[PDB]
């Protein structure tokens, strides 16, 4: 029970910290998101990289 009390007091603190931090977060966009998604989707469907994958190497995604 005491171990449960200590674990609960740690968990609540962590949870409150995460929510308070999440209220203030902000992100910026990049140009590697959609090509990376397309690459992963193609490997998921077929198991091989899409034809003429050099452009994906140019974006630094094919890996």
């Amino acid at each position: 029970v005491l171990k449960m009390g200590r674990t609960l007091e740690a968990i609540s603190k962590g949870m409150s910290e995460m929510l308070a931090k999440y209220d203030h977060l902000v992100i910026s966009t990049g140009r590697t998101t959609a090509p990376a998604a397309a690459f992963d989707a193609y490997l998921n469907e077929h198991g091989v990289p899409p034809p003429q994958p050099a452009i994906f190497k140019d974006l630094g995604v094919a890996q």
Binding site: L25, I27, T29, A34, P35, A37, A38, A41, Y42, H46
Partner: protein
């Protein structure tokens, strides 16, 4: 032959090739920014033009230098305006005096007609200044120029149409401004002295020339030559012609209106027009293309001036302040880019001052808003166009996860809520219930949480998962693929869209085909499941499909807006995805939920504006944002979740990700034929670099690729704002603008000023919140161009100020012209275009006669112009001399223009269309109009000669396609002569399996048999036959033909030209001769009747005698309203008796409401006010969730055919052959979906149950709000003998409203004036039509079960969605 250069300007203005022409003539020009054009070798088809001797004599005594087109524009306009009167002998035909004569006669006729109909003599009086023959030639400054440019534009179209002969040219020599037209170019030639005009140098006089010649001593090139030249294209000339016609129409309408009223006419005065026209011309000439930056401000300035009219509140002037500051900011930029002294640029300041300082009423500002395109359009450069797009589509955004998260959760909540209120239960959830506690106990109890508590538990919607909705294998329309569209070429051959000589190398491969209609017929398989499979496997990501190209839009004033073009199969994927979205899921988002709040009932407003669930007052305020700037701001980080949720909702996978997966992999460029990318070479070609034209890694969206999804996301964010601020909002989306209205509640005892201030404060709170919410999504509302106002709104395509609709007539009536875009320059095409434009124009104003004059003028002009300058014949041909061997007289053309179109004449301006667009029976109204016109013309003995013409030779299918017409050769449209050719080409050049299965070998026999069978009942009913024919596979076949008609080399494919010429001569012979077409027996027989219904009945029986075979026709003839009811005036106030110059049972009663709610600017005109009334509001055991079009049409056919036949019959054997051709259901199951029946009178109740009606009068909608119509006093017709009569009680309301509106259109009202009258029923036209059934003695004997393979026609599993 079939296709000709466009009659009006519809394309962007591009002047690249002009640089190549100038280099091939030895002149200098710098139109283009592309360095490829400075040193390439000239394409041969342009280089060969320097050998023509006419062009060398035209360029005699000219300078080496040229000038741009706009620096001359001002002088061009002035020169044509003042010099066109000395060249009447060039256009001696077109007979201008006869045009004026016919227009005057037509106004007199309409005045007599309206005086007889309204029952009051002397309503319309004579201002002898507008009625004299010399009014328009002498007082309109654009008359002669307009005629000259009509003539010259026909010549220019002829010269461009020919494929280039080196001897085909035209020229015009004036006192100034010589012109010369060659294959694709027009050359303007002006004296040098008129440009310098006693100045130090050429750049000193025109500072805009410093862009071409920075600072150079130009006098060595101008001393020895008397003229200077500017080279331009054919589109520049067409734009000039368009500008003259628009300005002439606008000036004439305004001048006549101001002579008509002279106190208040809803048109700007002529002083303002003259000033704006001159100053705009000067602004364009001095600043060239940039000038359009200043001129682009006319529309927002007009709107901002309209807004300053209600109860004063400081905020009402902020928008005007912002626009003025923007206008001067622009000016300051232009003045430093060209180093212009302050004393030189007075025209721009005069332009802004002329707009602001004229203190017009809101109506005149709303009309002045329509002159935006009266100065032309700018020249476009693709690098300047794509700089903005590149900067906006590659920029980085700062996003906040919390806003994105919450708007996604709101998206899911909206979908779920619409599902629950549609089907009364939760969809089948599949997620663990423990994750969402709040939603669990609403799901278990099958209840939906209230609007107040959604915000507190918003996060819980992230975990909800469920079963798929909206099955994919059915879409409603399936005719969206056939439609015309522009596509790009495959990536192996992407250079092929450019010129070989400009490129500098020959591309190894050349492309096979491009347009949609020609490539849909070429695809051999085309399943719909195969498109789905194409998307599921991500086949497009193959290297062959990675091409994308832009193209610019036609008629705007900005630096250039682009629409995109995709390869063919990616275009199929896009069309399928958008159609799927628009049918299934876009229905849960109301994007047009708005109605004007001042026009809505108080109980409805109170119910809608209450947050939870009377002593309350509701006041609204709106603001306007621009949706055009949304497309480029969307990023994947934002839209991943919405796309994935759509994928789950449809069960498919990877379907809605196509744009974000594909676009960043393409090479973005403009497919301009003469402007390749700056830096592409032969070895560079496979992986070209970035330059000014082109770039890699487009990261945003494009203008129309995913419109449905973006609008849905916008609605979700607006709803999130509604949850946050706890205020009710109503949004509407027009084509470009979206207007949002905030509703606020006040106590009864509140001062009006306080309410006005507080409503705007609440609207501003909402606007700030929305600005933040979209800013954290990467989309930036620009507060500088946004205004908050209490009265101004866009609702339809119209503008409202405090609920009072404002006129917008010039927008549609200024484009009236002699020609339209038709086949082989058809006369009916032109006249029909004029007629439709006229009816809309009258719907948008309160002045009738000024627009009528223009319509009649252009009708007679069209006749003369096409008579002696037809493009389909040799240069001088004189159709009338070939046809009748002598020239036509004025009376013959007049009589042709009087005869209604249903009778084989050329009248498309029916006066009855001033009242309502949908006319029940066109034949009876046409006979009424013809009788009135002949009584006015004093030739009353020609009636029975003109209506009794020889019937032609028509089959049953022609009569089924045209139910309400006659068997006269002259009334038939021209497309019916080409349809047979189109079908033949379809059976030659098609490999598509769907098309080959639909147009199988024996379709003609099916058409013949079905049409013959539908007219075999003992009493024939043509409306029923037409309704049935539209739903058989023959109707689908006709629809596909209609889609495919508007094409090239399909319709086109010597002897085709000769066939068309012979058809044209035959049609003219039938139109302009009435002694040739006569049946003396028919005239002798018709001569006895006096009612118009008997005449119509006899004509219909006699004309289709061969088809009818002695049986009698029913269900077609209905009386004309203007003959059935007469206007009797009961009470008129004392102030109106002086203005109308007058000195002193079953009926509908009409009166005028004395109480006024709003008014702008005063109460002196009836169309300036609104009231309280609303007279238009007064006038299934099973249902499938997703019914296909085939099932809907099958249900409609079963309903109609069951309702027509008798109960004691053997209906089933008649129903099986029709139903087996559409769906797979048996007979009995179908009956489970029919609604309630067993009440009606077949002849009478067919027209009102299944007809197509007009829901309102063709007037501005302010009058209906003050009309008190009461249809309780017309005796036994208020269902005793009422279900069994001719009267249609929905159209009498339109007639009453229209009479009240038209009678008082110019009277000067006061607070003490009132009006009440009544419509009296007449006995001649009323008939008692007994209830009667149709008896079919034989079922259809043809195998219609042959389309089991077509999903376009057949539904193999008709009911796979929920039975519900």
């Amino acid at each position: 032959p079939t296709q000709y250069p466009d009659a009006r300007l519809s394309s962007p203005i591009i002047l690249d090739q002009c640089d190549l022409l100038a280099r091939s003539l030895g002149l200098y020009s710098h139109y283009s920014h592309n360095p490829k054009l400075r040193n390439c070798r000239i394409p041969h088809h342009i280089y060969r033009l320097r050998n023509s001797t006419a062009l060398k004599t035209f360029l005699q005594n000219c300078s080496i230098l040229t000038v741009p087109f706009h620096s001359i524009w001002d002088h061009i306009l002035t020169s044509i305006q003042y010099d066109a009167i000395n060249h009447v002998d060039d256009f001696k035909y077109l007979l201008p005096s006869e045009l004026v004569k016919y227009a005057n006669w037509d106004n007199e006729f309409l005045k007599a007609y309206l005086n007889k109909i309204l029952g009051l003599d002397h309503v319309f009086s004579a201002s002898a200044r507008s009625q004299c023959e010399d009014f328009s030639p002498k007082e309109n400054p654009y008359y002669w120029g307009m005629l000259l440019l009509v003539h010259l534009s026909q010549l220019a179209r002829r010269i461009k149409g020919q494929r280039g002969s080196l001897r085909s040219n035209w020229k015009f020599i004036g006192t100034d401004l010589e012109l010369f037209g060659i294959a694709d170019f027009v050359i303007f030639k002006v004296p040098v002295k008129t440009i310098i005009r006693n100045a130090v140098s050429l750049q000193a006089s025109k500072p805009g020339l410093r862009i071409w010649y920075r600072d150079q001593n130009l006098t060595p090139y101008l001393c020895d030559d008397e003229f200077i030249v500017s080279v331009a294209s054919y589109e520049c000339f067409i734009m000039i012609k368009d500008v003259f016609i628009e300005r002439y129409n606008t000036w004439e309408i305004c001048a006549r209106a101001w002579l008509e009223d002279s106190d208040g006419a809803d048109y700007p005065p002529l002083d303002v027009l003259g000033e704006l026209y001159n100053q705009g011309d000067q602004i364009i000439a001095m600043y060239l293309e940039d000038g359009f930056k200043l001129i682009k401000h006319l529309e927002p300035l007009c709107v901002s001036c309209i807004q300053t009219h209600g109860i004063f509140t400081p905020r009402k002037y902020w928008f005007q302040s912002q626009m003025i500051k923007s206008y001067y900011d622009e000016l300051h930029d232009l003045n430093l880019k060209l180093q212009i002294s302050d004393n030189k640029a007075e025209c721009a300041q005069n332009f802004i001052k002329t707009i602001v300082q004229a203190k017009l009423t809101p109506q005149q500002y709303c009309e002045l808003f329509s002159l935006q395109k009266h100065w032309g359009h700018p020249v476009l450069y693709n690098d300047v166009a794509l700089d903005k797009v590149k900067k906006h589509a590659q920029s980085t955004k700062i996003l906040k996860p919390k806003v994105m998260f919450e708007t996604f959760c709101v998206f899911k909540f909206i979908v779920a809520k619409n599902h629950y209120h549609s089907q009364g239960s939760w969809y089948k959830t599949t997620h663990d219930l423990h994750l969402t506690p709040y939603l669990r106990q609403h799901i278990v109890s099958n209840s939906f949480p209230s609007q107040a508590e959604i915000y507190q538990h918003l996060w819980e919607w992230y975990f909800v998962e469920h079963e798929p909705l909206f099955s994919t294998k059915i879409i409603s329309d399936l005719s969206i693929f056939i439609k015309d569209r522009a596509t790009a070429v495959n990536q192996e051959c992407w250079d092929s869209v450019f010129d070989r000589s400009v490129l500098g190398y020959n591309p190894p491969v050349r492309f096979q085909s491009k347009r949609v209609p020609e490539q849909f017929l070429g695809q051999a398989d085309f399943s719909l499941n195969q498109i789905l499979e194409f998307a599921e496997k991500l086949e497009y990501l193959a290297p062959s499909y990675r091409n994308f190209s832009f193209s610019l839009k036609e008629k705007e004033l900005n630096i250039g807006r682009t629409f995109g073009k995709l390869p063919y199969r990616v275009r199929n994927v896009q069309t399928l995805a958008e159609a799927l979205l628009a049918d299934g899921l876009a229905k849960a988002f109301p994007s047009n939920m708005m109605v004007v709040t001042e026009r809505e009932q108080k109980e409805a407003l109170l119910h809608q504006a209450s947050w939870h669930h009377e002593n309350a007052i509701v006041r609204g305020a709106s603001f306007v944002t621009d949706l055009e700037k949304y497309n480029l701001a969307f990023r994947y980080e934002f839209t991943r979740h919405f796309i994935d949720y759509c994928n789950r909702c449809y069960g498919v996978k990877n379907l809605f990700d196509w744009m974000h997966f594909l676009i960043p992999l393409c090479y973005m460029h403009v497919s301009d034929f003469y402007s390749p990318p700056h830096c592409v070479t032969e070895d560079n070609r496979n992986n070209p670099p970035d330059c000014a034209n082109a770039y890699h890694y487009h990261l945003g969206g494009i203008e129309g690729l995913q419109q449905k999804l973006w609008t849905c996301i916008s609605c979700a964010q607006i709803t999130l704002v509604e949850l946050k601020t706890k205020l009710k909002l109503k949004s509407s989306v027009m084509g470009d603008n979206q207007c949002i209205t905030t509703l606020s509640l006040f106590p009864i005892d509140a001062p009006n000023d306080y309410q006005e201030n507080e409503a705007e404060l609440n609207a501003a709170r909402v606007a700030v919140e929305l600005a933040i919410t979209t800013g954290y999504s990467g989309i930036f509302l620009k507060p500088e161009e946004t205004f908050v106002h209490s009265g101004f709104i866009y609702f339809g395509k119209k503008q409202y100020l405090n609920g009072v609709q404002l006129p917008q007539s010039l927008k549609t009536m200024a484009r009236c012209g002699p020609l339209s875009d038709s086949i082989f320059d058809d006369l009916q095409g032109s006249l029909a275009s004029i007629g439709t434009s006229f009816e809309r124009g009258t719907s948008e104003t309160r002045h009738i006669f000024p627009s009528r004059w223009i319509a009649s003028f252009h009708s007679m002009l069209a006749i003369n112009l096409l008579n002696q300058n037809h493009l389909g014949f040799p240069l001088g041909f004189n159709i009338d001399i070939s046809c009748f061997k002598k020239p036509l007289t004025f009376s013959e053309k007049l009589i042709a223009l009087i005869t209604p179109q249903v009778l084989g004449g050329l009248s498309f301006l029916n006066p009855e269309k001033l009242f309502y667009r949908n006319i029940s029976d066109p034949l009876t109204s046409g006979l009424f109009q013809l009788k009135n016109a002949l009584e006015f013309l004093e030739k009353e003995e020609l009636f029975y000669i003109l209506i009794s013409k020889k019937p032609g030779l028509a089959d049953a299918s022609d009569f089924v396609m045209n139910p309400l017409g006659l068997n006269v050769p002259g009334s038939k449209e021209i497309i019916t002569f080409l349809r047979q050719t189109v079908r033949e080409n379809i059976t030659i050049t098609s490999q598509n399996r769907i098309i080959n299965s639909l147009f199988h070998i024996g379709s003609d026999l099916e058409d013949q048999r079905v049409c013959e069978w539908l007219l075999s009942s003992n009493p024939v009913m043509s409306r029923f036959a037409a309704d049935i024919f539209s739903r058989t596979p023959s109707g689908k076949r006709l629809q596909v033909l209609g889609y495919l008609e508007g094409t090239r080399t399909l319709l086109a494919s010597g002897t085709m030209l000769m066939k068309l010429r012979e058809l044209t001569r035959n049609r003219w012979k039938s139109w302009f001769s009435y002694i040739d077409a006569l049946d003396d027996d028919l005239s002798e027989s018709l001569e006895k009747f006096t009612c118009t219904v008997d005449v119509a009945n006899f004509l219909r029986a006699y004309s289709w005698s061969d088809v009818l075979k002695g049986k009698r026709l029913i269900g077609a003839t209905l009386p004309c309203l203007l003959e059935q009811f007469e206007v009797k005036w009961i009470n008129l106030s004392e102030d109106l008796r002086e203005q109308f110059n007058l000195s002193s049972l079953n009926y509908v009663s009409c009166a005028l409401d004395r109480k006024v709610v709003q008014k702008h600017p005063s109460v002196n005109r009836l169309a300036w006010t609104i009231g309280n009334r609303a007279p238009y509001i007064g006038s299934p055991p099973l249902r499938v969730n997703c019914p296909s079009a085939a099932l809907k049409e099958a249900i409609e056919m079963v309903s109609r055919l069951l309702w027509v036949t008798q109960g004691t019959a053997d209906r089933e054997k008649l129903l099986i052959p029709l139903l087996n051709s559409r769906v797979n259901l048996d007979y009995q199951t179908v009956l489970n979906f029919l609604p309630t029946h067993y009440s009606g009178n077949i002849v009478h109740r067919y027209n009102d149950q299944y007809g197509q009606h007009s829901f309102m009068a063709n007037r501005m909608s302010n009058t209906s709000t003050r009309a008190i119509i009461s249809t309780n006093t017309l005796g036994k017709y208020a269902g005793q003998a009422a279900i069994d009569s001719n009267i249609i009680f929905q159209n009498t309301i339109n007639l009453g409203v229209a009479v009240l509106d038209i009678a008082l259109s110019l009277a000067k009202l006061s607070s003490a004036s009132n009006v009440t009258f009544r419509l009296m029923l007449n006995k001649c036209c009323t008939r008692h039509v007994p209830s009667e059934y149709l008896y079919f003695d034989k079922p259809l004997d043809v195998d219609l079960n042959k389309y089991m393979d077509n999903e376009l026609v057949y539904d193999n599993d008709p009911l796979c969605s929920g039975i519900k």
